Amino acid sequence: GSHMKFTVEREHLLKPLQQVSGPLGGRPTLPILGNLLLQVADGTLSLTGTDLEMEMVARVALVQPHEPGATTVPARKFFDICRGLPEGAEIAVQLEGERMLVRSGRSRFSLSTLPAADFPNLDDWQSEVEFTLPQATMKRLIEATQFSMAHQDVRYYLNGMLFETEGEELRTVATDGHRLAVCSMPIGQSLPSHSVIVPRKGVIELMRMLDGGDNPLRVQIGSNNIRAHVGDFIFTSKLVDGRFPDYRRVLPKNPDKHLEAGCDLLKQAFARAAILSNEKFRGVRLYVSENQLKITANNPEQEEAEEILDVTYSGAEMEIGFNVSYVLDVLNALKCENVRMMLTDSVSSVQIEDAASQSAAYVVMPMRL
């Protein structure tokens, strides 16, 4: 069609406009990537946003009369206009020449457009593995590892999150070369083995599309893409093409010593000690002895923090150095009563996990003291 036209309730257009337009803020690579593609056909309005690496498509049912067609319109401006109209407002949209008109009551907006024919599309592909899972399960998997992803590392593949399917479980892995996080959850379906790297921005969009409702999440994974469906929203992302580190070989092989303590008391002791640790290197010293942990921090001003805790420990005495932010990140992600630490020696990685559950594990490499 040449004369796209539709009328929809603001109520029905607002959450879809947010789902797709959310990450279309900032400087688009190309001017058209700042626009949303609008398509009207056979009772449906489609709204697409992209950045060339991923795309977000929302479908809105059209109950009132409409004329088919397509155009692109500035995403944020279109969203702000619809959000700014009063509750219960009816929004009438139509192309007029090269402009998109938005009307509601006596409010009239004329928006600039770019041709729908110029809107980029992701390359077609086929899913190799498909499954469903609750939104809460995806959120738990992502929250348990996301903080361990690398921050703009030269090793591009550490900047994303590994998603792995094995047996009845979905697993995430993130590491930045100093610390690693891994979490596995049961999804109730027998699945083939697949391992993919989802880019940083894709992980952010997968989290953003979880509304906390009862709508299930359907996932499809291909060779070079991942796709997630929730209600009438579809998120697609390209995959990072690289070889991710293997977590099974990174987990300490034979931890000699086992320490157990209350998660919160250990977190509050590390948090207080962190105040007087070096602002750049963040080094703290752990001294483990019989049922006792001593945490010490010092900084260039020669200020010192010292925390003594009662813990459960019966191994040999040892001193080990850690970046206190890596330890606090683990303790903050373990939202549990008691935590277990598995040590070997002062120059080897430590494994940290909930003392009750093995669904998540964390590995932190020490620092020289």
Binding site: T175, G177, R368
Partner: peptide, 5 residues
Amino acid sequence: QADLF
């Protein structure tokens, strides 16, 4: 800081 791998 030591490398984990």
